[PDB]
Amino acid sequence: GTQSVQKGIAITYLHVTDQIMKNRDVIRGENFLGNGEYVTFAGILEANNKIYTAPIPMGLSVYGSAFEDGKWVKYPELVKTEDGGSNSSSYEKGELQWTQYPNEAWVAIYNDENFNNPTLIRTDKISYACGRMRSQYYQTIWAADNGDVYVFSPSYAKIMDADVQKTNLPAGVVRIKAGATDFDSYYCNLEELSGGKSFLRCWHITGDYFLLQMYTGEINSRGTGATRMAVFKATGNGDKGELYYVDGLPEPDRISSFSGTPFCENGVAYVGVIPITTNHPAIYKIDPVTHTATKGLTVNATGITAIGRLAKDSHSTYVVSATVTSANSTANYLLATSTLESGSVTPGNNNGFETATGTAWIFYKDQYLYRLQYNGVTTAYELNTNGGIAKRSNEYTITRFTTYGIFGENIISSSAVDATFTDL
Numbered sequence: 114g115t116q117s118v119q120k121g122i123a124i125t126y127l128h129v130t131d132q133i134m135k136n137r138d139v140i141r142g143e144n145f146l147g148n149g150e151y152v153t154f155a156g157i158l159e160a161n162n163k164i165y166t167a168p169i170p171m172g173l174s175v176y177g178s179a180f181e182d183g184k185w186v187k188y189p190e191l192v193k194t195e196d197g198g199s200n201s202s203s204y205e206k207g208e209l210q211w212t213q214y215p216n217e218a219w220v221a222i223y224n225d226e227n228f229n230n231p232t233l234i235r236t237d238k239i240s241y242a243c244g245r246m247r248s249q250y251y252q253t254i255w256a257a258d259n260g261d262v263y264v265f266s267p268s269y270a271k272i273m274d275a276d277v278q279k280t281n282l283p284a285g286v287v288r289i290k291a292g293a294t295d296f297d298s299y300y301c302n303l304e305e306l307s308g309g310k311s312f313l314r315c316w317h318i319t320g321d322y323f324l325l326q327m328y329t330g331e332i333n334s335r336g337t338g339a340t341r342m343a344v345f346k347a348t349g350n351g352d353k354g355e356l357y358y359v360d361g362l363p364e365p366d367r368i369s370s371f372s373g374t375p376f377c378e379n380g381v382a383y384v385g386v387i388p389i390t391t392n393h394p395a396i397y398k399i400d401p402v403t404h405t406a407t408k409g410l411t412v413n414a415t416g417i418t419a420i421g422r423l424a425k426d427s428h429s430t431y432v433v434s435a436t437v438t439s440a441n442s443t444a445n446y447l448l449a450t451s452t453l454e455s456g457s458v459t460p461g462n463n464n465g466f467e468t469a470t471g472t473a474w475i476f477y478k479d480q481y482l483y484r485l486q487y488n489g490v491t492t493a494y495e496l497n498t499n500g501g502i503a504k505r506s507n508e509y510t511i512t513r514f515t516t517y518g519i520f521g522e523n524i525i526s527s528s529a530v531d532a533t534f535t536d537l
C-alpha cells in the first residue's frame with residue numbers, strides 16, 4: 114500500500130487500578146463521517162455501559178482536499194492557497210479550515226473503550242455538539258440519571274467568516290433515549306427560552322437538570338461575556354425543555370470566570386466563581402430545583418482548578434485545587450477542607466500540597482485525583498491511610514489532548530493528530 118500523512122484520532126488510556134498507560138493504535142480521522150472531513154472527539158461520556166462522543170468536524174486536511182481530485186471539496190474557494198493563521202487557527206496550504214457542513218450534528222456510540230465499530234448517527238436539528246473558546250473544545254453531550262443522552266449545541270459555527278460555514282440553526286438540544294441507537298423526536302430551541310442567548314459550555318447536575326454557562330451578548334471565540342448561569346430541565350414543560358437563569362450569583366459585570374468543572378453531590382452543583390479584581394474566588398452552591406445560588410467556601414488564591422472528594426478507609430475530605438499566579442510564576446495547591454459551604458481555605462498549612470499546574474484535572478470517584486499534563490508529566494493523587502494528600506507512585510508522559518473523560522477504570526484522553534496511514 115501507499116503510506117501518507119493523514120488526520121487521525123489518538124486515544125490514550127490511564128488505568129487507575131494498574132497505574133499503567135496505554136496508547137491505542139491511531140484511528141483514521143479522514144472521512145470519519147462520510148464526507149471527507151476529519152474530526153475531533155468532544156466528550157468521553159459513559160452511559161448505559163457505552164461511550165458517547167460528539168465527532169466535531171474540522172474541515173479537510175491537505176490529504177483530504179487533494180483526495181481523488183478534490184472529490185470532497187464542496188467549496189473550493191475556501192481551500193487555503195498558502196500557509197497562514199495563528200495559534201490553534203493556524204492552517205497549511207491546501208487545508209479547508211472548519212466544516213463545510215455546519216447545519217447538522219453527529220454522535221458516535223461505542224460499545225466499550227476499545228473504540229471499535231461506532232454507531233454513527235446524525236441530526237439536522239442542531240449544529241455540532243461542543244463549545245469552543247480559542248483552542249479549547251468543551252463537552253456538551255451529557256446523560257440524565259436515567260441514561261437518556263442529551264446532545265446540546267451552542268451553534269458556535271454562527272461566528273464563522275464565510276456564509277456557507279455559518280450555521281443557521283439556533284442553539285438547541287436533542288435526545289438519544291437510553292439504549293436507543295438513534296435520536297428520538299425531542300427538540301428544544303434554547304435561544305427562544307434564553308432571550309436570544311447561547312452558552313459557552315454546559316454540564317449535568319442531577320436527574321434531568323443541566324447547568325449552562327450562558328452568554329450575556331453574542332457567542333465569540335474568546336468566551337467574552339460568559340458570565341451567567343442557567344438551569345435547564347430537559348423534560349420540563351411537557352417534555353419541551355425549561356430554562357431558568359440562576360439567581361444569587363455575583364452580578365455578571367463582577368465575574369471574571371467560572372471554574373471549568375462543577376462538583377455535583379446531594380442534588381446540587383458546586384461552582385467556582387472568580388471575581389474581577391480584596392475579592393477572592395469562592396464556591397457557590399446551585400440548587401437546580403429553585404435555580405438559586407448561595408456563597409460558600411472562600412478560596413484565598415487566584416483561581417480554582419478542581420473541586421472534588423478523596424477518601425481512604427475511615428478518612429475523607431473535600432479537595433479544592435487552587436492556582437496561585439504571580440507576576441513571574443504559576444503555582445497550584447491541593448487544599449483539603451471539611452466543607453464547601455462556609456469558611457475559607459489558604460495555601461500555607463499542612464492541609465495543602467503543592468503541584469505544578471496541570472492542563473486539566475479529573476477525579477476518579479472519590480479515590481484518585483488526576484492532573485493531566487502533556488509536554489511536563491501527568492501525575493495522580495490520593496489520600497494516604499493517615500488521611501493526608503499523597504502523590505501516587507507512577508507518573509506518565511501523554512500527548513496534547515482536546516478531550517478527556519472516564520470509562521470504567523480508564524481515564525481516556527483524545528486529540529486529532531497527524532499520523533501515517535496506509536491506503537490500498
Ligand SMILES: [Cl-]
Pocket residue numbers: 257258259260320321
Ligand atoms: Cl433522570
